[PDB]
Amino acid sequence: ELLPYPHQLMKRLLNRISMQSQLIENISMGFLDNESKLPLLCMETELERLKFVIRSYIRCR
Amino acid sequence: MYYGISQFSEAYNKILRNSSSHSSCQLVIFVSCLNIDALCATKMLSLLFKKQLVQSQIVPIFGYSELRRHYSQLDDNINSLLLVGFGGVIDLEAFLEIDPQEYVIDTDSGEQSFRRDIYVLDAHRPWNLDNIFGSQIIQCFDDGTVDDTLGEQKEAYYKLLELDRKQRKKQIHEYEGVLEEYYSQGTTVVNSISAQIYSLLSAIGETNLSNLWLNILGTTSLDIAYAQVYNRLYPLLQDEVKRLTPSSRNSVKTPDTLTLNIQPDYYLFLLRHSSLYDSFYYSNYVNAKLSLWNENGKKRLHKMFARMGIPLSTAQETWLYMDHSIKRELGIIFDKNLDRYGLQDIIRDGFVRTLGYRGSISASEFVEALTALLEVGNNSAQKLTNLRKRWVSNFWLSWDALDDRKVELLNRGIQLAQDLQRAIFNTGVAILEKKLIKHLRIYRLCVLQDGPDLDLYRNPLTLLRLGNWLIECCAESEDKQLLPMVLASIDENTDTYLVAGLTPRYPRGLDKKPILNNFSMAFQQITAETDAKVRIDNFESSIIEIRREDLSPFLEKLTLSGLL
Amino acid sequence: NGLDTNNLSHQEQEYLKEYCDLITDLKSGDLVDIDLSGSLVPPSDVFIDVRVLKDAGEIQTEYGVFNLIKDSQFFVRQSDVERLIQQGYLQKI
Amino acid sequence: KIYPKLHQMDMDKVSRVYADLRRESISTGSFPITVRHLESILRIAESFAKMRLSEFVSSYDLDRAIKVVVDSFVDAQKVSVRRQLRRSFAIYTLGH
Amino acid sequence: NDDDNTEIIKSFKNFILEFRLDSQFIYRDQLRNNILVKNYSLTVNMEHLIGYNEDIYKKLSDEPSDIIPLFETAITQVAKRISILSRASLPTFQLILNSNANQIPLRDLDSEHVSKIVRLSGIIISTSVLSSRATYLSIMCRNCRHTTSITINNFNVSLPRSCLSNCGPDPYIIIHESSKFIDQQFLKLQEIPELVPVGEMPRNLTMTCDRYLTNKVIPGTRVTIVGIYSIYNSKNGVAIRTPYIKILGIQSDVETSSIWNSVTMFTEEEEEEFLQLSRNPKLYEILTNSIAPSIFGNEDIKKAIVCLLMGGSKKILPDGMRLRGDINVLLLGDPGTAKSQLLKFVEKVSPIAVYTSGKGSSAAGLTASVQRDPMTREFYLEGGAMVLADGGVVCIDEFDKMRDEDRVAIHEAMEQQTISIAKAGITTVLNSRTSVLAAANPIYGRYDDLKSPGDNIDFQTTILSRFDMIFIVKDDHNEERDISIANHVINIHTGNANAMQNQQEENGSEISIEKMKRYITYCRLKCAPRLSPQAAEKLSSNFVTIRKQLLINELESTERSSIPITIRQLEAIIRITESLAKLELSPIAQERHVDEAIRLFQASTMDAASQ
Amino acid sequence: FRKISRDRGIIDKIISSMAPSIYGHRDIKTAVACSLFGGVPKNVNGKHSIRGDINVLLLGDPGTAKSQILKYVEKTAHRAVFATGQGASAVGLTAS
Amino acid sequence: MSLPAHLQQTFSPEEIQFIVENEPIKIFPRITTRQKIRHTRWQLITTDDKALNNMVAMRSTEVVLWIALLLKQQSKCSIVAPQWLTTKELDRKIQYEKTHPDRFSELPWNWLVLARILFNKAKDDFHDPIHELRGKIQDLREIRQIKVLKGLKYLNESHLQLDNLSLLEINELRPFITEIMDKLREIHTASLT
Ligand SMILES: Nc1ncnc2c1ncn2[C@@H]1O[C@H](COP(=O)(O)OP(=O)(O)NP(=O)(O)O)[C@@H](O)[C@H]1O
Ligand SMILES: Nc1ncnc2c1ncn2[C@@H]1O[C@H](COP(=O)(O)OP(=O)(O)NP(=O)(O)O)[C@@H](O)[C@H]1O
Ligand SMILES: [Mg+2]
Ligand SMILES: [Mg+2]
Ligand SMILES: [Zn+2]
Known part of the structure; x- marks a missing residue:
């Protein structure tokens, strides 16, 4: 079956991807001026892992 | 001086500070292809920058003409360069057309900084002084040569740089006299580039068995031509194998155990991967002691196997299938018998790696495989370029064969090495039977005009295999005077000769101060004097190309040259 | 084409254009933050x-x-x- | 023991010899000169290098072989054309 | 002694269970994969056995006949552990060996090798019927009626001389109902032609294989064997006994398929190379230049040899009428034109072929001969060159020097694709579906182009009509062509052509013998193309033009033509039209194939008849 | 052998030594010398092969040492076989 | 269509890896990120951020497996194998499997997937010698494959029960079990009036 769409869940996640992707860019402006880079690497690879689940979800439906 | 051995951590931390970001690629490594030591150095250095997450690009380069082309087109965001295996002996600031005023930033204070660093990882000498003293952008790494050897040149360089009439005549010709003696030294390799990067990994605290194997491979490649250097470094490699090898002994073999032993590694050709007969027949050293090109030399080989008590039918079995009793008795058979033939020097201890159940490879056998991948792994401007593209393409076959996941590509290499050494031998006998080595008083000349599969010898490395075979052969004969040798080979398609100048060397067991390749000056000085067409663009500047009709005029002025 | 035209009938050459235009209309909107044509x-x-x-x-x-x-x-x-x-x-x- | 190789400096001589031998073999009852008779000049040149016990065919072996193959072709012709053929082939018959 | 065998067995169970490279337990996995498809065997590569524990390889190679049957039981014990639940049967597994030990030339086998594992190679000249050996005898006593059994392993045992518990001196009979048996086959292997010493007849071994190695070969295949060189006490000298090989691993060199019902033995890594190659826009140029690359010119003969290697398509009507799909070609011509060098090439590219000389041949030696078996004293039938070449090409060189009684035996085998026999109370029609490629000279050696074109040719219209393309290969003495050949031939002798043929293969302008043999073998199994309805409109309008042309040429010549056009030659142009569609793996044949098939027929049979 | 092989004119010494008791016929002695040493047999990438042996036809008048030249080569060659006219069959040559 | 044919009704093995990488794993950090009372910070949105900003070298902690593998790719972590990846606990499960033909043992849903990930990425962090762990993971893989082949003799129009089968062992069987039970259902429902 085509299951019913998670309306409020999807609006929430598409906010957090927009806010988090702005945050990763803002933190990359501090690096122009400790200064350890693992949390930047994790915040970026988490958005790739999350954007994949939503793309794979929408492409499926 | 520029970065001494004590201060490689500062040069590395400077790379991290300048060129680490998650935003962009910022680091470029230019590596000379056609150099195994530069390959093993660059493999270690990439595993390091992988672990630090430094985004980087590796570009293999054939020669100086391609160095200018690739440098000319670097994206201006690239702010660190490593030049691995070349450029120490050329003025890089002049050659690349740098003016530091176009590179300087934040000049304030007794201070400078620059938008690019150029770090030179090179083992060749004599160092160009305008790199080692005369530049702030070029940043050489050192084994110790500068502080130990260059103190008179340092002083002469600065007093001449400051001095932009008796009191002047009395001094300007003293200091130019010191530089003029410092140049007018022949070329030599004095260290491995891989042992330099392993001493950097030792400063950072990154050493492990994978980096140690690449250190052993890179350093072993010197043994054929710079034996005097392999023997300095070999004691230091033994200590690191002990330091990193785990506690267990009388250990059970399991698919997961890597063992990197120090054990007998006889000076024979591809022993563990060929027969015991082909091991002797195709060895440079054996051929040199037995005179094994002519059929009385082949009799001396059979007469030796018969006296050792190994049937020819057993000696010719592939070493895996050769019987369990011979393979453990072999240390005793050689320690009894080799002395009769003077082959005693074949007994050697070396590094032997075995992984799981897949059977041992020695560092010697592994570099024979990796070189065979560089050599044969796959309108004259197109005819050169579509050939130099092939030698850049082969670098990635040798690179991928350093990975343990890719043993099938090492096994390609081990088959190709046995195809090459057979062709070298079948050509080397033709030279010695037909008397093609002419004695020209100052040097020995050899010129391959025609022959079977002659189209191999247009790769600079394959010409140097045949060079090292003819050199070992001469260097053991007690009547010949040691003389520089010139080895030339035609390409019938480009219509040039590839010409290589070779240093002789002392017999493999005698134990002197080194001798230096002064063809690198003699070819430049004769080239500057003549109107002939040549290429002087190779990184091993003992090797040149010349159009067919210009060769005899060139050699005619080489014999007159006082520079050899 | 999210990132041979002789073989197609003219309605299919037309349909393939209109459908590539529909794909780019989905990713050009809300849901732009994820590249739907991606891997x-x-x-x-x-x-x-x-x-x-x-x-x-x-x-x-x-x-x-x-x-x-x-x-x-x-x-x-x-x-x-x-x-x-x-x-x-x-x-x- | 001996198996001689070729230097490839022969190309114009052997090709003109074969072209001449074929062109003069238009005569009706003449010897059947064929690609297996070019190939013969190359076999005979290798046999002379074996007699000198050499691993390489010289241009003197290629001349002796062309002389043997041309002389044996010309001697098979009728007296009515043997003069014309000796006169035509002189650069190859008098080569050794 | 059975403490010692239990340790040898335990040490090989642990080879199967522990041997690993990378993540994968390659012998546990191979056992399970073989159990599911129900072949109870394991192939072991001996470099891995040496890598695990060299003492085991030492034990094995010292006395194979006593250690191979201990590794077979170690395999069965693992096979139970990995495929049956304990505490909730399989036969004895075969061990098959792969090796890279040095090949011993077949004539160098001698007393030094008796009982050793020996690797070698040769041409299979014969295969027997299957025979049954026991692996388990059920047993019962004649007198006291005690019952037991004997497990048998077939290396280097017999019925017991004592009742085991007077009961008598030879007490036991075999209960056949409860016994179990295995297949055994005898081969004969000749040595490879390029390894026979000067002036000797090629030497021969008999050898035996059993279980999953039976039926793995056919006569004419070139094979490498691993086996135990060993001896048997035949009744056929003094203190003397006959050598043979117990075969432990056949390995056919080119994947020549053996006994094979067209089954899908290809692998996806080569099938996807072929399926790209089919779709190359230049494919017919590539295959034409890959035929005999050292032979200059002869371009149409190479184009026709490519058609012959594919064949057309075989058809079977609701009538029951069978249509020939195989193409036959005749190279009739002047001396030294590469006719025999092209036959010696098609013998090597074709996946099955036989080269023969018509002067060295008989009717019986070509088709099938009646032999008399010296033991049964019965007659039996043996296949000649046409039966050996079945499904392939027979190359008949010197076809003009064949006797008139021998040439006629070929007439059935060229059209109806059978060999009928009625001799010594045997009667059969044997199948033999081959292409014939033949080479010949005219009467008077050269073509004598001024003489009548029927007075040059010896052959009757009965045999000439059985050839689909006849090439009259004239040699023409044009000086520009003779220089172009002279330069080419010298580049072969001087060794330049070797490097050029290597460079053209690397350039993709040419393909190797091994690749081409496997491409031909694939096209024969994936395509049998039909004519499109528009291809019939062209082939009909053409063939009636070819007959009008012939009738006019006969009216000038005042006689029946010696080279015919007949309806068997319409089917030749149809069959060529299909061969060109098999090359590119087309499911159908089209107007572009019909244009090239009419062109090749014009350049061969019709320009040969026109003379 | 190595010493004499570098005699200037070794070919013409060896040719003069073919059937040394038969006078003249230096073209036959030359042809016999070439056939008796042979050329080099060739195989090309494994695909193709070329004949290295040299075949010779002595055609001519009676009582001219054609048969004595052949009976000398039977003494001189390593492995040799002699056959004659009506005494030789299709499969006594060849094989049966 | 929008979704490739080989994904239309099942997960790729790489998607079954991606699902398993979302689980918590215990680690020993080799970095102290914890700031003292006497700097960059993680700020994640799919997992608990409060575990990573509080690392202290060599005191164990739990993190999501895809972060443990990303830290272990540098020298900056070591991954503590679960209790069931011990030669004791694997050998109790092998005994359970042999003892109960009728059932699969209570291994966690991800056991093959997690064994394959950690044997490649964390090969040095096992207390037992990894060649005996690989050996027993294979012993378990093979026994469960026999029990699966026994289970397929019962494909049905109504249902099956497959209690402790792993996600990777379900995912290989999915396009066979469901495709055959679908045709058994179509053949059955067709017979009904
Ligand atoms: N076109 C050619 N290109 C290359 N080699 C050729 C060519 N024509 C002839 N030769 C060579 O010359 C010889 C020809 O002999 P062969 O191939 O046996 O001739 P043939 O056509 O069968 N003549 P024949 O048996 O006399 O009717 C071989 O060694 C060939 O390789
Ligand atoms: N040129 C010659 N020099 C020396 N003796 C010769 C010469 N020609 C012929 N003879 C001798 O005379 C005889 C004839 O030679 P023979 O080989 O028998 O002749 P042939 O040429 O084969 N003639 P034929 O058999 O009739 O075809 C032999 O005894 C020879 O030794
Ligand atoms: Mg022929
Ligand atoms: Mg006579
Ligand atoms: Zn009894």
């Missing part, structure tokens, strides 16, 4: 070694600039090169 192989991989398989010189891409010199190798974040891998300029993974 369905999961991102198990962070940085990758990639070997540049064809010469293409200096090229731009949204995230940065590469000089795609024949048989140079890059170690770079998978998410930057993934479209160049798909176009076949790059090799490995």
Whole structure:
């Protein structure tokens, strides 16, 4: 079956991807001026892992 | 001086500070292809920058003409360069057309900084002084040569740089006299580039068995031509194998155990991967002691196997299938018998790696495989370029064969090495039977005009295999005077000769101060004097190309040259 | 075409255009933050070694600039090169 | 023991010899000169290098072989054309 | 002694269970994969056995006949552990060996090798019927009726001389109902032609294989064997006994398929190379230049040899009428034109072929001969060159020097694709579906182009009509062509052509013998193309033009033509039209194939008849 | 052998030594010398092969040492076989 | 269509890896990120951020498996294998499997997937010698494959029960079990009036 769409869940996640992707860019402006880079690497690879689940979800439906 | 051995951590931390970001690629490594030591150095250095997450690009380069082309087109965001295996002996600031005023930033204070660093990882000498003293952008790494050897040149360089009439005549010709003696030294390799990067990994605290194997491979490649250097470094490699090898002994073999032993590694050709007969027949050293090109030399080989008590039918079995009793008795058979033939020097201890159940490879056998991948792994401007593209393409076959996941590509290499050494031998006998080595008083000349599969010898490395075979052969004969040798080979398609100048060397067991390749000056000085067409663009500047009709005029002025 | 026309009937040459235009209308809107035409192989991989398989010189891409010199190798974040891998300029993974 | 190789400096001589031998073999009852008779000049040149016990065919072996093959072709012709053929082939018959 | 065998067995169970490279337990996995498809065997590569524990290889190679049957039981014990639940049967597994030990030339086998594992190679000249050996005898006593059994392993045992518990001196009979048996086959292997010493007849071994190695070969295949060189006490000298090989691993060199009902033995890594190659826009140029690359010119003969290697398509009507799909070609011509060098090439590219000389041949030696078996004293039938070449090409060189009684035996085998026999109370029609490629000279050696074109040719219209393309290969003495050949031939002798043929293969302008043999073998199994309805409109309008042309040429010549056009030659142009569609793996044949098939027929049979 | 092989004119010494008791016929002695040493047999990438042996036809008048030249080569060659006219069959040559 | 054919009704093994990488794993950090009372910070949105900003070298902690593998790719972590990846606990499960033909043992849903990930990425962090762990993971893989082949003799129009089968062992069987039970259902429902 085509299951019913998670309306409020999807609006929430598409906010957090927009806010988090702005945050990763803002933190990359501090690096122009400790200064350890693992949390930047994790915040970026988490958005790739999350954007994949939503793309794979929408492409499926 | 520029970065001494004590201060490689500062040069590395400077790379991290300048060129680490998650935003962009910022680091470029230019590596000379056609150099195994530069390959093993660059493999270690990439595993390091992988672990630090430094985004980087590796570009293999054939020669100086391609160095200018690739440098000319670097994206201006690239702010660190490593030049691995070349450029120490050329003025890089002049050659690349740098003016530091176009590179300087934040000049304030007794201070400078620059938008690019150029770090030179090179083992060749004599160092160009305008790199080692005369530049702030070029940043050489050192084994110790500068502080130990260059103190008179340092002083002469600065007093001449400051001095932009008796009191002047009395001094300007003293200091130019010191530089003029410092140049007018022949070329030599004095260290491995891989042992330099392993001493950097030792400063950072990154050493492990994978980096140690690449250190052993890179350093072993010197043994054929710079034996005097392999023997300095070999004691230091033994200590690191002990330091990193785990506690267990009388250990059970399991698919997961890597063992990197120090054990007998006889000076024979591809022993563990060929027969015991082909091991002797195709060895440079054996051929040199037995005179094994002519059929009385082949009799001396059979007469030796018969006296050792190994049937020819057993000696010719592939070493895996050769019987369990011979393979453990072999240390005793050689320690009894080799002395009769003077082959005693074949007994050697070396590094032997075995992984799981897949059977041992020695560092010697592994570099024979990796070189065979560089050599044969796959309108004259197109005819050169579509050939130099092939030698850049082969670098990635040798690179991928350093990975343990890719043993099938090492096994390609081990088959190709046995195809090459057979062709070298079948050509080397033709030279010695037909008397093609002419004695020209100052040097020995050899010129391959025609022959079977002659189209191999247009790769600079394959010409140097045949060079090292003819050199070992001469260097053991007690009547010949040691003389520089010139080895030339035609390409019938480009219509040039590839010409290589070779240093002789002392017999493999005698134990002197080194001798230096002064063809690198003699070819430049004769080239500057003549109107002939040549290429002087190779990184091993003992090797040149010349159009067919210009060769005899060139050699005619080489014999007159006082520079050899 | 999200990233042979002789074989198609004219209605199919037309339909393929109208459907490529529909795909770009979905990703050009809300839901733009995820590249819907992107890969369905999961991102198990962070940085990758990639070997540049064809010469293409200096090229731009949204995230940065590469000089795609024949048989140079890059170690770079998978998410930057993934479209160049798909176009076949790059090799490995 | 001996198996001689070729230096490839022969190309114009052997090709003109074969072209001449074929062109003069238009005569009706003449010897059947064929590609297996070019190939013969190359076999005979290798046999002379074996007699000198050499691993390489010289241009003197290629001349002796062309002389043997041309002389044996010309001697098979009728007296009515043997003069014309000796006169035509002189650069190859008098080569050794 | 059975403490010692239990340790040898335990040490090989642990080879199967522990041997690993990378993540994968390659012998546990191979056992399970073989159990599911129900072949109870394991192939072991001996480099891995040496890699695990060299003492085991030492034990094995010292006395194979006593250690191989201990590794077979170690395999069965693992096979139970990995495929049956304990505490909730399989036969004895075969061990098959792969090796890279040095090949011993077949004539160098001698007393030094008795009982050793020996690797070698040769041409299979014969295969027997299957025979049954026991692996388990059920047993019962004649007198006291005690019952037991004997497990048998077939290396280097017999019925017991004592009742085991007077009961008598030879007490036991075999209960056949409860016994179990295995297949055994005898081969004969001749040595390879390029390894026979000067002036000797090629030497021969008999050898035996059993279980999953039976039926793995056919006569004419070139094979490498691993086996135990060993001895048997035949009744056929003094203190003397006959050598043979117990075969432990056949390995056919080119994947020549053996006894094979067209089954899908290809692998996806080569099938996807062929399926790209089919779709190359230049494919017919590539295959034409890959035929005999050292032979200059002869371009149409190479184009026709490519058609002959594919054949057309075989058809079977609701009538029951069978249509020939195989193409036959005649190279009739002047001396030294590469006719025999092209036959010696098609013998090597074709996946099955036989080269023969018509002067060295008989009717019986070509088709099938009646032999008399010296033991049964019965007659039996043996296949000649046409039966050996079945499904392939027979190359008949010197076809003009064949006797008139021998040439006629070929007439059935060229059209109806059978060999009928009625001799010594045997009668059969044997199948023999081959292409014939033949080479010949005219009467008077050269073509004598001024003489009548029927007075040059010896052959009757009965045999000439059985050839689909006849090439009259005239040699023409044009000086520009003779220089172009002279330069080419010298480049072969001087060794330049070797490097050029290597460079053209690397350039993709040419393909190797091994690749081409496997491409031909694939096309024969994936395509049998039909004519499109528009291809019939062209082939009909053409063939009636060819007959009008012939009738006019006969009216000038005042006689029946010696080279005919007949309806068997319409089917030749149809069959060529299909061969060109098999090349590119087309499911159908089209107007572009019909244009090239009419062109090749014009350049061969019709320009040969026109003379 | 190595010493004499570098005699200037070794070919013409060896040719003069073919059937040394038969006078003249230096073209036959030359042809016999070439056939008796042979050329080099060739195989090309494994695909193709070329004949290295040299075949010779002594055609001519009676009582001219054609048969004595052949009976000398039977003494001189390593492995040799002699056959004659009506005494030789299709499969006494060849094989049966 | 929008979704490739080989994904239309099932997960790729790489998607089954991606699902398993979302689980918590215990680690020993080799970095102290914890700031003292006497700097960059993680700020994640799919997992608990409060575990990573509080790392202290060599005191164990739990993190999501895809972060443990990303830290272990540098020297910056070591991954503590679960209790069931011990030669004791694997050998109790092998005994359970042999003892109960009728059932699969209570291994966790991800056991093959997690064994394959950690043997490649964390090969040095096992207390037992990894060649005996690989050996027992294979012993378990093979026994469960026999029990699966026994289970397929019962394909049905109504249902099956497959209690402790792993996600990777379900995912290989999915396009066979469901495709055959679908045709058994179509053949059955067709017979009904
Ligand atoms: N076109 C050619 N290109 C290359 N080699 C050729 C060519 N024509 C002839 N030769 C060579 O010359 C010889 C010809 O002999 P062969 O191939 O046996 O001739 P043939 O056509 O069968 N003549 P024949 O048996 O006399 O009717 C071989 O060694 C060939 O390789
Ligand atoms: N040129 C010659 N020099 C020396 N003796 C010769 C010469 N020609 C012929 N003889 C001798 O005379 C005889 C004839 O030679 P023979 O080989 O028998 O003749 P032939 O040429 O084969 N003639 P034929 O048999 O009739 O065809 C032999 O005894 C020879 O030794
Ligand atoms: Mg022929
Ligand atoms: Mg006579
Ligand atoms: Zn009894």
